[PDB]
Amino acid sequence: STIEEQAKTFLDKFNHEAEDLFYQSSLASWNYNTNITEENVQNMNNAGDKWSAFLKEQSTLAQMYPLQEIQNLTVKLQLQALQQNGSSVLSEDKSKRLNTILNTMSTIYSTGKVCNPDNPQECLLLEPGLNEIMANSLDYNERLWAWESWRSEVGKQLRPLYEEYVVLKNEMARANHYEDYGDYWRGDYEVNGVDGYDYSRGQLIEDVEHTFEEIKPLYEHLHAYVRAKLMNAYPSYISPIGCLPAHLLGDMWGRFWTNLYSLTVPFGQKPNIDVTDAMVDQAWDAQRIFKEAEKFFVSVGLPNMTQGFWENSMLTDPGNVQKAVCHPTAWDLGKGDFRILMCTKVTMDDFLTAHHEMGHIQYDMAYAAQPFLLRNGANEGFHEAVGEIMSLSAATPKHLKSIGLLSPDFQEDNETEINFLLKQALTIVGTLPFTYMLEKWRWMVFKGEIPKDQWMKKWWEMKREIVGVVEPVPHDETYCDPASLFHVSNDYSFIRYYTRTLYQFQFQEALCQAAKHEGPLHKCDISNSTEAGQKLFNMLRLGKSEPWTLALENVVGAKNMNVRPLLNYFEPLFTWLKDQNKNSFVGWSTDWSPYAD
Amino acid sequence: DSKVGGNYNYLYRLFRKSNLKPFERDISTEIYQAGNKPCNGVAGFNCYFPLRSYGFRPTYGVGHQPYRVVVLSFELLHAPATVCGPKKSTNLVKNKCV
């Protein structure tokens, strides 16, 4: 009864119950996901309902213990995570209104239908075909149509709903001593009073705007190259001092330039590394690939699979007609019962996805000792970060020719290396300007700086200034372009895909500087080492029990995200791009327009 | 001992005033009291039950599946002789110095 035991002494009970219930819920869910029937939806909805009701009751009960009389750090962190009101601080009818606006937004996004002006009877959804038209077509007219349509029919309906959504979320967040909603998102990177490891909610914006400054020397050259290359497929449509038209990037919103590899390959007659026929000519099943992944993981010094994962998991899609959503996922039903749900085919891409998923499996195996409320990554970003380095280290030619899938006399050269590096940088450094731009735009519109009659003009001037792309058609203020992105119209945070891109290469360099590697970083492997495994595992097992700025400094040695490893990873590509642009004009002028000529 | 859907028979106490004494036994079901206000035998805000149950199933990992434990303990108070180990033998030859 030391004013605190009363807290812990609760915490225990909570812990137990929580864990148990959660498990019930989760088994239920895995079920429905692996065997789609009509009754299983009911078997899982009530389990989720009971879990949610129990958690909200415990949250309403935890309030009775003040948060300044606690002295131990871990119990304070657990209470601070549980004591969160979340929603339901609003007026009751406004809560239902918020649920309705959210669900209506999600539905209008999901079931969008756009139809041709030449044939309005049968037409296209978003997922089947629209992405294919925007990715694989090659005529300017069809791309411009597919681009303007989706923003003229799904951008116009969403604005009068997003307007109310903003103010409702702001009034929600403003009851928990917060000043807007964006701060309620940045609050994930917050650390209070640990004598030096503190990280104020504000300094996240400072880091982001301070690390985006060092990327531009590389992104500018990449933009110049991609532009001078796109000036071949569509002759006399781009200006050599202008920006790019949004409907030429490779998808609906311009998030990944990966589909531009067909037009901008450096050496179009030297094929890259690809183990796809060598696999099937060796009769590899879904079992063999996972055995290879586990062998690689155990080679570095991590434990085996739990021997309950080989009988329960579903590695190959069920033969008969058994509807199960084929989207890879790593389940941690808790209680040490880990599973992997994915419809593996015999392709090297699935061979890399297996590694990327067993990464999450290992990361979940590590921290299974912490209290139940601390079973996550250090923040939202570390999870996929620690996941992706396995795929980045398993795709190098060394690890391939050491497993029996490449001819021993396969000799790699600098041409294939530049090819691979551009294929990588079309995805890694390509999405960063878009990500930072969209997140800054959302923070701005939430804090109230941008008046609600200047949304689209500000968004497009930002697309002109930062990322270097220009709209093809004018858009007045009956539109809303950002509401046409999945992570926006569904109330999903969108800054993790910018911190992950940095944490990735920081982890890569920090780790395989212990494997005593000597060459460029893009050939670096973490196999056969034991110091690397220990360095990684001394962070994998913390969970949330320590501030993330300590989880970093125990791996790389710094107390923040630094972009230097990224540039050090791309240095060869940068040396090449500095030569292939001796005659073009780097940068872009925000005056050019595709219609004002 | 593990049945699908939860086997809630085995309990294990996780609240008590002070730790036990060796070889002692406690089976009470008096409602715990952590706060400063007496309970009067009603669960709720600070006033929990003292018994929980292991929900053993079959799809658990090692370290959570039910293990069975038995312990033996000897003690020789004052008896002259008691249960000892088993004896063994050989045969019975005759007419030989043995």
Ligand SMILES: *[C@@H]1O[C@H](CO)[C@@H](O[C@@H]2O[C@H](CO)[C@@H](O)[C@H](O)[C@H]2NC(C)=O)[C@H](O)[C@H]1NC(C)=O
């Ligand atoms: C997928 O779920 C369905 C819905 O229950 C299962 O179908 C029945 O499941 C019960 C459960 O024991 C069986 O007794 C019936 O014989 C099943 N009937 C049919 C027509 O399937 C189905 O078995 C589940 N699939 C798997 C692989 O377990």
Ligand SMILES: *[C@@H]1O[C@H](CO)[C@@H](O[C@@H]2O[C@H](CO)[C@@H](O)[C@H](O)[C@H]2NC(C)=O)[C@H](O)[C@H]1NC(C)=O
């Ligand atoms: C509460 O704080 C105390 C210290 O303030 C923690 O005690 C340490 O616990 C770890 C293992 O949990 C031991 O290895 C240390 O030896 C303990 N320190 C001392 C000085 O004895 C305690 O762990 C904290 N509570 C929780 C749940 O972590």
Ligand SMILES: *[C@@H]1O[C@H](CO)[C@@H](O[C@@H]2O[C@H](CO)[C@@H](O)[C@H](O)[C@H]2NC(C)=O)[C@H](O)[C@H]1NC(C)=O
């Ligand atoms: C969470 O919401 C509650 C309202 O439901 C806020 O108000 C506190 O509610 C608790 C119990 O419901 C009371 O004991 C407090 O006196 C209330 N006022 C406070 C704590 O200032 C509560 O403030 C909200 N949580 C936070 C962290 O602000």
Ligand SMILES: *[C@@H]1O[C@H](CO)[C@@H](O[C@@H]2O[C@H](CO)[C@@H](O)[C@H](O)[C@H]2NC(C)=O)[C@H](O)[C@H]1NC(C)=O
């Ligand atoms: C890949 O490596 C080869 C050999 O190391 C390079 O070939 C030489 O490149 C320099 C660079 O200007 C030229 O001056 C030489 O004339 C090249 N050698 C021959 C025999 O012609 C090649 O350039 C490298 N690839 C790239 C893209 O630079």
Ligand SMILES: *[C@@H]1O[C@H](CO)[C@@H](O[C@@H]2O[C@H](CO)[C@@H](O)[C@H](O)[C@H]2NC(C)=O)[C@H](O)[C@H]1NC(C)=O
């Ligand atoms: C690095 O790891 C590989 C993976 O096991 C080890 O590969 C073995 O290498 C020896 C000799 O090079 C071969 O005889 C074995 O057949 C290989 N094993 C397999 C499964 O292919 C390699 O030994 C490790 N490196 C060192 C220095 O031990």
Ligand SMILES: *[C@@H]1O[C@H](CO)[C@@H](O)[C@H](O)[C@H]1NC(C)=O
């Ligand atoms: C992992 O499993 C293999 C089975 O092939 C076994 O030989 C090895 O000893 C195991 N290692 C550990 C650490 O459990």
